[PDB]
């Protein structure tokens, strides 16, 4: 007499590609309280839906092929064409919400709208503001990940969404999670650079950035003094799959390390959202509410009549 | 067939003659006598320099060793012969001529056997002299010298003068300065040198060898070690010929690990 409502086997599309909103996930959503959200923001090819499915309901020892998120396919990397369009939706068995999201300023997105008000590049830059945004304003946690270093652009990016939101202000966490790390990434040399770039690059971005999910802590470098850093910032690094000297790959499993990041993403605090007890079902109508209220914005219009 | 390798000679003396090269190989006293006109050739074309005679010398050198790989006392005379035409033109400075000598030249000292007491001052100061320039050269004439190197070490047994190998193990020589390329084989071709010369008989020729590269590790683990603000120890093996170096924290690590 206290069976579950539903498991979820596969995710589903909360936002239409057309940006509508899609209410079909109330079959999966209860009346309890204390809920947590993630966000993933990231470029073209960063791998977005294969850590959220590693990270939900996956395993590396799992197939691509039965992954939660579905992921690009050999045909398609030839062709340079994005897979995940829109924001897709799955919660997991521990009542945990996991969203997804499309690729931001992607070619493909251009490529498909050329052959389809002033200019293409303007609404392709504002969808992935309003996403930016939105993701900003109802997520607990959100994830950054990028393919390469040193990209200059994304920061630049962050910091003009976080000042075209909507609306005791609420700054939801962050966490630098660089994805396809080699085994010069894994040395504390570079480790400080990194550390000091981003702590420079961000000085004043009002976000929270720092004191959580520290690196040092979560046994990475056994022999690392936490001292030897000024401000151990939340970022994270994932390795590729599974010469004078032999071996010596340079870095730790991937299992382990993909792991380590599901129990600290999983461990994280869930603040409150708004000056009211929100539950899943008041939470996807607060979502809906404010997507439908960012849609006809007033912020977006001033900023596209500029460009 | 006296007179028909002529032709094939006179055509590829003109990318196919690795096509040439192999037919004539395959192919098969005469070659004895042939000697004579290329030798005599070479000699003119070198007095008369003293430039278009670059392209004609690197094809003599190319069919001299296409020939002889082809096939006991006129060995050291061609070998001193080659030698001293190849050091006369000393103005152009052509490296094709150069790597078509060096092969040549490692070729002939191959073929025979570490048995005698050939001259070895003359293919030492060509090898140093090379070293002296062979900085900013082309990748096919590094390959080539480095070659050549190993080819001479591993010939000349028992007959390494302290001072050959102790001036070829510092920071002045430019052996040091070769490993550091991007390409793999300049590597492959190091490490293989640094083997065929950790590879010898003499207890005495080889102590300073192994003294320089302990050396080199001590100084580039006390520059990593200051680097870090720790002070240096394991002083027992200290060179005096890293007295004071200083080595960046990449290049010192690559350094301990080449070594
Ligand atoms: N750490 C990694 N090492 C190697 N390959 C990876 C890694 N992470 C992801 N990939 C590969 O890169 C691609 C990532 O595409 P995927 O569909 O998983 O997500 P995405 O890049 O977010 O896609 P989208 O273009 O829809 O934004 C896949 O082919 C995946 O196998
Ligand atoms: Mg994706």
């Known amino acids: 007499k206290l069976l579950p409502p539903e498991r979820m086997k596969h995710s589903i599309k909360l936002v239409d590609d057309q940006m509508n909103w899609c209410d079909s996930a109330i079959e999966y959503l209860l009346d309890q309280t204390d809920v947590l959200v993630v966000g993933v923001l990231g470029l073209q090819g960063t791998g977005k839906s294969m850590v959220m499915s590693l990270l939900s309901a996956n395993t590396p020892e799992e197939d691509q092929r039965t992954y939660v998120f579905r992921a690009q396919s050999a045909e398609m990397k030839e062709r340079g064409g994005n897979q995940t369009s829109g924001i897709d939706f799955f919660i997991t068995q521990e009542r945990i919400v996991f969203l997804d999201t499309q690729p931001i300023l992607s070619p493909s997105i251009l490529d498909h709208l050329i052959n389809n008000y002033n200019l293409p590049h303007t609404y392709v830059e504002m969808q992935s503001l309003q996403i930016a945004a939105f993701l900003f304003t109802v997520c607990h946690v959100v994830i950054v990940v990028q393919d390469w270093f040193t990209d200059l652009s994304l920061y630049r990016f962050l910091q003009t969404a976080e000042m075209v939101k909507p609306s005791t202000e609420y700054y939801p966490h962050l966490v630098f999670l660089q994805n396809k790390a080699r085994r010069e990434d894994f040395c504390p040399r570079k480790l400080r650079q990194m550390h000091l770039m981003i702590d420079q690059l961000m000085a004043h971005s009002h976000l929270r950035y720092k004191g959580t999910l520290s690196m040092l802590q979560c046994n990475v470098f056994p022999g690392l003094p936490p001292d030897f850093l000024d401000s151990e910032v939340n970022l994270f690094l994932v390795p590729f799959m599974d010469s004078l000297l032999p071996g010596y790959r340079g870095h730790p499993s991937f299992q382990s390390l993909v792991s380590k990041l599901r129990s600290q993403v999983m461990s994280m605090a869930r603040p409150q959202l708004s000056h009211t007890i929100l539950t899943e079902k008041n939470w996807f109508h607060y979502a809906a509410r404010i997507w439908d209220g960012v849609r006809k914005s007033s912020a977006l219009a001033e900023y596209s009549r500029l460009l | ?259």
């Open chain 2, 1 to 259: 067939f006296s007179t028909n390798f002529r032709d094939t000679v006179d055509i590829l003396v003109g990318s196919l003659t690795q096509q040439v090269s192999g037919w004539l190989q395959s192919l098969e006293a005469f070659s004895t006598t042939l000697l004579g006109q290329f030798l005599e050739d070479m000699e003119a074309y070198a007095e008369d320099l003293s430039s278009v005679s670059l392209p004609k010398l690197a094809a003599l050198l190319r069919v001299f060793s296409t020939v002889v790989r082809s096939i006991a006392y006129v060995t050291d005379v061609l070998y001193r012969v080659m030698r001293c035409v190849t050091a006369a033109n000393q103005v152009f400075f052509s490296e094709a001529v150069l790597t078509a000598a060096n092969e040549c030249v490692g070729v002939l000292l191959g073929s025979l056997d570490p048995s005698m007491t050939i001259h070895c001052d003359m293919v030492i100061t060509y090898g140093l002299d090379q070293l002296e320039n062979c900085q900013t050269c082309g990748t096919d004439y590094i390959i080539s010298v480095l070659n050549l190197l190993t080819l001479i070490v591993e010939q000349i047994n028992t007959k390494l003068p302290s001072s050959f190998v102790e001036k070829l193990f510092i920071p002045s020589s430019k052996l040091l300065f070769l490993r550091y390329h991007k390409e793999k084989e300049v590597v492959a071709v190091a490490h293989a040198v640094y083997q065929a010369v950790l590879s010898l008989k003499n207890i005495p020729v080889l102590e300073t060898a192994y003294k320089l590269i302990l050396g080199e590790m001590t100084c580039a683990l006390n520059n990593l070690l200051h680097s870090l603000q720790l002070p240096e120890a394991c002083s027992e093996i200290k060179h005096e010929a890293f007295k004071n170096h200083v080595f960046n924290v990449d290049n010192a690590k690559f350094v301990v690990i080449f070594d």
